[PDB]
């Protein structure tokens, strides 16, 4: 309703860098809010794309941001009669970024890895990797849970079980309130997908430069499966956390698997041991149900609700025609131990190929009426196809079914405005939470400041 679309603030990265591809708010140890921005095609040392991360101080006028530096050099370690190799070219550092406390985690899902041993090898594959920074102290660490030292032939002889070579760890990421980093790795176990978790504190304390293969003992990884419903499900394409079993001591995980079951799609809610508590199935094959997930209580009863995006959903129209517009599903969490039901609300796109539901951001309570609200992106939506973000307000029965406000992309065609979104943080400290919108195709980020409601609704 009350985001201000007149005086925006723009931040900008290098041309071609895809600055804005991912972003998050970051609070320093004194609570000053900044914006961390991933730019997964930023040029590295060999004038080769490797990705990069920027840490943008808040300023109404926006502008350029300093880099948050990470080591971009390929590494080699000859040890235990093997050769370990990391390959950073085109790794897409900054394809995901998240902030927790005063730490920043930025991931490179396509970082490759190989292990040589005489004439054999593991195979050079994208295991992905994450880079952790504490900007104030300069501390750095890394976490790459799918690196292995097993040779190719061993996987063949063992029928490709527990094969974490194509994980793409860091493809998605999230951090629990207690500080457990949770990485989605949709290539995990031969393209089933897996999750990897470890406390941030333990990642820092167990990491040293140059080791390349090291143990994080408190880490926990999900499981392989022989069930074909999971094959090529990309479980972990998106991830989130929240409270779904009534017990405030345990954190539950929400995992999108947009091609689960021969592309039907699914989203699963799991306990922290990866035991499945509920499964939501997509409605339509190939709609990419689970591309995005969001967790927030929208109807003010204190219980977290789940939103799921299916950006390629095809709506039925006149004369047995189908129109690809995208759809968002709202599931309200019921009182006490009970299955999430059918969806409480379906929000459906209007613009052909607009991809409504491609991203969904909790806004906290934008208009301050006591119900949390959300922003849904349609990166190619709007009447001109340039991208729109739509705001939906919470209320006692769930969400309003018509947007209270629509933000049309201020960028040119192709910017993919809305592809990343983050809300619920008050960046200018005026008592209203604000919204940041990435437009990686234009290498920019737009900040929308929430302002006092003009007339309430």
């Amino acid at each position: 309703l009350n985001l201000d679309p007149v005086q925006l603030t723009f931040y900008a990265g290098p041309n071609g860098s895809q600055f804005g591809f991912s972003l998050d708010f970051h609070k320093d140890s004194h609570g000053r809010v900044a914006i961390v921005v991933g730019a997964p095609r930023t040029l590295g040392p060999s004038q080769e794309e490797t990705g990069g991360v920027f840490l943008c101080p808040w300023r109404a006028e926006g502008g350029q941001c300093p880099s948050l530096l990470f080591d971009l050099r390929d590494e080699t370690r000859n040890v235990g009669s093997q050769t370990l190799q990391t390959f950073k070219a085109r790794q897409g550092l900054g394809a995901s970024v998240v902030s927790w406390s005063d730490v920043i985690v930025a991931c490179a899902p396509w970082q490759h890895w190989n292990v040589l041993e005489k004439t054999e090898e593991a195979e050079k594959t994208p295991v992905g990797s994450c880079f952790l920074a504490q900007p104030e102290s300069g501390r750095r660490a890394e976490y790459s849970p799918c690196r292995g030292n097993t040779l190719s032939r061993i996987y063949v002889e063992n029928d490709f079980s527990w094969d974490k070579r194509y994980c793409e760890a860091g493809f998605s990421s999230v951090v629990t309130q207690a500080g457990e980093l949770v990485l989605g790795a949709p290539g995990g176990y031969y393209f089933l997908g897996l999750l990897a978790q470890a406390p941030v504190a333990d990642i820092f304390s167990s990491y040293r430069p140059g080791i390349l293969l090291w143990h994080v003992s408190s880490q926990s990884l999900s499981f392989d499966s022989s069930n074909p419903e999971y094959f090529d499900g990309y479980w972990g394409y998106s991830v989130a956390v929240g409270e779904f079993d009534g017990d405030l001591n345990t954190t539950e995980y929400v995992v999108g698997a947009p091609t689960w079951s021969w592309t039907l799609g699914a989203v699963e809610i799991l306990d922290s041991y990866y035991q499945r508590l509920h499964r939501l199935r997509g409605e339509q094959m190939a709609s990419y149900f689970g591309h995005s997930v969001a967790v927030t209580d929208v109807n003010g009863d204190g219980r977290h609700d789940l939103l799921v995006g299916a950006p390629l959903y095809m709506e039925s129209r006149a004369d047995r025609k189908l129109a690809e517009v995208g759809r968002v599903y709202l599931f309200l969490q019921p009182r006490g131990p009970h299955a999430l039901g059918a969806p409480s609300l379906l929000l459906t796109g209007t613009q052909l190929y607009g991809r409504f539901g491609s991203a969904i951001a909790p806004l906290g309570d934008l208009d301050r009426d006591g119900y949390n609200d959300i922003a849904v992106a349609a990166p190619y939506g709007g009447p001109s196809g340039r991208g729109q973000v739509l705001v939906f307000l919470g209320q006692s029965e769930g969400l309003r079914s018509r947007p209270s406000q629509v933000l049309d992309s201020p960028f040119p065609t192709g910017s993919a405005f809305g592809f990343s979104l983050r809300g619920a943080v008050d960046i200018d400290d005026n008592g209203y939470p604000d919204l940041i919108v990435g437009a990686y195709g234009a290498n920019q980020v737009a900040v929308y400041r929430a302002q006092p409601v003009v007339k309430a609704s």
Partner: antibody
Amino acid sequence: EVQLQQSGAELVKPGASVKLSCTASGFNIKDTYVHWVKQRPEQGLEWIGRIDPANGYTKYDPKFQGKATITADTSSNTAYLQLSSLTSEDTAVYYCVRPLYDYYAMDYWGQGTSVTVSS
Amino acid sequence: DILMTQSPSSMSVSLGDTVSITCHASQGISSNIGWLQQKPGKSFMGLIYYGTNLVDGVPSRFSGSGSGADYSLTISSLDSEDFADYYCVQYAQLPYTFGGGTKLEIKR
């Protein structure tokens, strides 16, 4: 807290066999490589081999092939060193070892198990 | 196999001293070396991994340095509990191989 707890002193006859154990306390034996090392006063320290108890795969210094078999059982969180065709020269102290962080290192040691081979 | 020649075999030193034990390898091992301590009639504790990294719990008066084929353990300001045996181990190649050790004894 990681501890490696090895079985008691062994006293055996030339030609017999013996099977030493090393039980993980405070952690899962499956988390890392587990190595076996031999120590004698004159000859000093010698690496026997290792096992990845997750999958049973082993490596040995060739000087010990046929003498030493290293196995593991995640169920009981234990790794084993089995010595065959015992000789006086097998009289030594045996240690199980695992890395701390570095996959390839040798940081945590069991308390040691004396093996004495005599008639 | 890689030979680890450790020196000196022993040294008679005093509390407060700074001493260094060296290790020379028959070929370069790029910091894939560990240092170990064994107190009299006791088991081993790890001190250093990968050339320069303190094992958790080890006091910082211990340090490791070196590169290529030559490495050192240095103990600044010797403590009474430092009079013990020390060994290096290389893990650049299988089989892992050890130095002959060094025993710190008390000067009188």
